[PDB]
Design a protein around this nucleic acid. Structure first.
Lengths: 93, 78, 107, 95, 107, 93, 78, 95
DNA sequence: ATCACAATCCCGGTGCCGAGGCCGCTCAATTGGTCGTAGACAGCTCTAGCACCGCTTAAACGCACGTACGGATTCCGTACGTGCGTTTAAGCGGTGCTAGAGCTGTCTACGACCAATTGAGCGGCCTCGGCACCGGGATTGTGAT
DNA sequence: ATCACAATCCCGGTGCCGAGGCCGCTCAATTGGTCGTAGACAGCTCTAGCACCGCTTAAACGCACGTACGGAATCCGTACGTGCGTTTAAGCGGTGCTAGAGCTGTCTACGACCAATTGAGCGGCCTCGGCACCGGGATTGTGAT
């Protein structure tokens, strides 16, 4: 039985910010729980925003607004920059 | 505008809270606490307004902001 | 047809855009999901993970350790006002607490 | 005739705990709301009910805080609320 | 065809089963909704409303009033341990508070 | 513009429990907010239960479990009785 | 079984909480508080187990119960 | 040699605030969990990780409560925690 | 105690406005039929939960003793509450102007969906390096003297 | 202060086991095409938000005065912390047994969906009764005396 997780991606990001630093299985479990939790919070807020505005589609605008409502202070500022940069790069393939 | 929250008003709020005696430094402390609370709620309410591309903050925007900060309000459309 | 290019590589991300898209579509959030929504969400998740991991790796190095453990994650989150606020109602298993003694208790 | 300190205070508690009316003047509160919102977005309009919703929530929040502040004062064997009582209540509440 | 019989009347309820079904189907809760789910939900909503209204009407009669106002609803909810717990993080507009003075403050 | 509400049903129930008692518009607004809030809580918990158990359908079983998790003490006991009675009556038309 | 939560264990928990001096009546009070907390979480966890038609409470059941009581736990599958 | 009352207590604070290990014995805690669950459902089995998850949450909750209880004691000019401090902390927290 | 007295409460006696009911209509719920798949169910497989036992120290416990902390008492000055005269501005009503909320029609680009292809991501496995720990020496704060 | 000394810390020196990488494969993401509708946009309509002004008292304010409360100092007994010898049972390892978790195949009843019909529920309107309030008399607690 295969159980999907964000372990591979957390490790990829760790090797970018700290090339010589590893991670324990317990710490990896914390990171997996963290990603899943934040995903739920953002997606749930984006869902509410769409419903409040009588819209049937969750777009990058809903995600951006959810990020501003949930992430505190500069966390929101930098997260919005990252999301906007990614969408721009993706649209130019 | 924060001074519009007068000492008598703060005293009335304390009386409803069952407070019998009040120190003179409580009025400035209360004004600061109220400012923080209002800023938090208004920030989120304006975020909802901007997302709706509106120029008018609605009662619904306020209700949603209160709900997400765990202060659900009944009586204003939810 | 053309060689398969992942949406993650198109967005320059390490996090999986395709998986995030599926999780949004099957998570009962909305009827439809825009093409940019998974890209934006994946980038935000990646940014947050990078922030915590960078701060946790620093805590590991300060403890003369080469592997991050739950203690290092707890240290990174509780020592940052914004991360502490984001994870206020969160318990890190085997994370412990910040060393803090009230001054009135000191000899 | 002069009522002893505390008698009129307790009479005011009885009166305000029986009433449900708003205790902050409406016009000054509206000015504060508009002044605070200006820092987030300029030229902002407000539904009359939006300002009323804000006033109801703020008053409820402050009354609730004054209740916990009072408990802190009584805990320190005092009948007078002080800033340290407000600070403790908020800290324990997580604020 | 046969004369139209509402699902509410079939369940012996005053609350709208058909509307509750639509709200579940369009509320992004699940892909499918069982036939009994709206009936069960409508009955629960009806039971809770009846409980609050009965207690609020009693409070109105105790205040020599013939119409329920927010004050009566607040009195009914805060004077009942279970209703108070259910509506703990809820503010009733124009509801006021329960008359409560600490004994140490009394003359 | 028509805005649906539970006002008619709240009034019907009020006339059953208190035939000579009316209700103010403000109090009616509180009741409408209450019904909407409880609906969301129950439906949201039922949604989580279905997802946790890898099910695509919200049935009376999910609603019953949600009621037990949200309603405190005897509120849950009586609400479950009401829901079960309604489903039984409905299935026998 | 509540007595298995010994005075030394409660003292250790207090020490991590930064407590220097402890009254003798705290041990019984703490036992009562812990019992209430455990009952609340276990009740919900068992409800999830019964809904899954299982006879074994899983770590996920506990995680879900903690999450809905506003005590999210990281490290046990969510 | 005899350390003055308080010296070893502060040494224990330093040691336990630096460690992350569980402070309740595992076997007694498991017995309590099983005894409490018996009242909800009979013949209940438990995953080893389920008991561990419960232990981690309970210890975190009690440590957090002891932190707030300490603040209440200091507020009353005491260095000793008493049941009234636990009661106040829980009341303000909404428990 | 006894009496003034100041504030609240209780009760008729009226204005008035919103609860409450009705009416027309429409849009959303019901009836009926049709079809695809979610889930219940039966059977099987094997994971991991339970039971238990025998040691082996670490932890718990029970008690002895001393002292520092909690609480009761005392005193005293001033920061509060209460009251009153004076100023301020909230509230109300009225009037006027206009931004922008809300809605409708139109039309297109975007998202769902489906088939075909394919490569990332999963488990399974395997193995060296990080780390836990042991021991021993240095370091360092604590306390009697 | 000076010195014992008891506890912690820091650092080599080893076992060991889990982080970490690889491998095979498959299932889920990508490519490509196809089609229906969500939403952006333009235009229009009219609601309600804003601005303002002129009174009219209620509220706010500033101050005077007295006293009750907050806090500082004092004393004292005992409930705590610390230490030590003795008991208890947690932890660990090992072994065995089996409930029940997890999975797969099958098959059907149930839910989605669509067209046709229709009736509950919406706004709009309208109007009497509940209630807010005014005033006046009784009630009642508070405080000087």
């Amino acid at each position: 039985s295969r159980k999907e997780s964000y372990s591979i991606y957390v490790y990829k990001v760790l090797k970018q910010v700290h090339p010589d630093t590893g991670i324990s299985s317990k710490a990896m479990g914390i990171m997996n729980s963290f990603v899943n939790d934040i995903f739920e919070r953002i997606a749930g807020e984006a869902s509410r925003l769409a419903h409040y505005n009588k819209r049937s589609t969750i777009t990058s605008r809903e995600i951006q607004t959810a990020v501003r409502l949930l992430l505190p202070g500069e966390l929101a500022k930098h997260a919005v920059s990252e999301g906007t940069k990614a969408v721009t790069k993706y649209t130019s393939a | 505008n924060i001074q519009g929250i007068t000492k008598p008003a703060i005293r009335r709020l304390a009386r409803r809270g069952g407070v019998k005696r009040i120190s003179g430094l409580i009025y400035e402390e209360t004004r600061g606490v109220l400012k923080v609370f209002l800023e938090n709620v208004i920030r989120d309410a304006v975020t909802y307004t901007e997302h709706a591309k509106r120029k008018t903050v609605t009662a619904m925007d306020v209700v949603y902001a209160l709900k997400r900060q765990g202060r659900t309000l009944y009586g204003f459309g939810g | 047809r053309a060689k398969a290019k992942t949406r993650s590589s198109r967005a320059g991300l390490q996090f999986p855009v395709g998986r995030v898209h599926r999780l949004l579509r099957k998570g009962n959030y909305s009827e439809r999901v825009g093409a940019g929504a998974p890209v934006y969400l994946a980038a935000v998740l990646e940014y947050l993970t990078a922030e915590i991991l960078e701060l946790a790796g620093n805590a590991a190095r300060d403890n003369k350790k080469t592997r991050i453990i739950p203690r290092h994650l707890q240290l990174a989150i509780r020592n940052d006002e914004e991360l502490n606020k984001l994870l206020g109602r969160v318990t890190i298993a085997q994370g412990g607490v910040l060393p803090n003694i009230q001054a009135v208790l000191l000899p | 005739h002069r009522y002893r300190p505390g008698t009129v205070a307790l009479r005011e508690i009885r009166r305000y705990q029986k009433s449900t009316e708003l205790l902050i003047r409406k016009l000054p509160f509206q000015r504060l709301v508009r002044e605070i919102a200006q820092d987030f977005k300029t030229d902002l309009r407000f539904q009359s009910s939006a300002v009323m919703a804000l006033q109801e929530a703020c008053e409820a929040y402050l009354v609730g805080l004054f209740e916990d502040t009072n408990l802190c004062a009584i805990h320190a064997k005092r009948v007078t609320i002080m800033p340290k009582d407000i600070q403790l209540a908020r800290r324990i509440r997580g604020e």
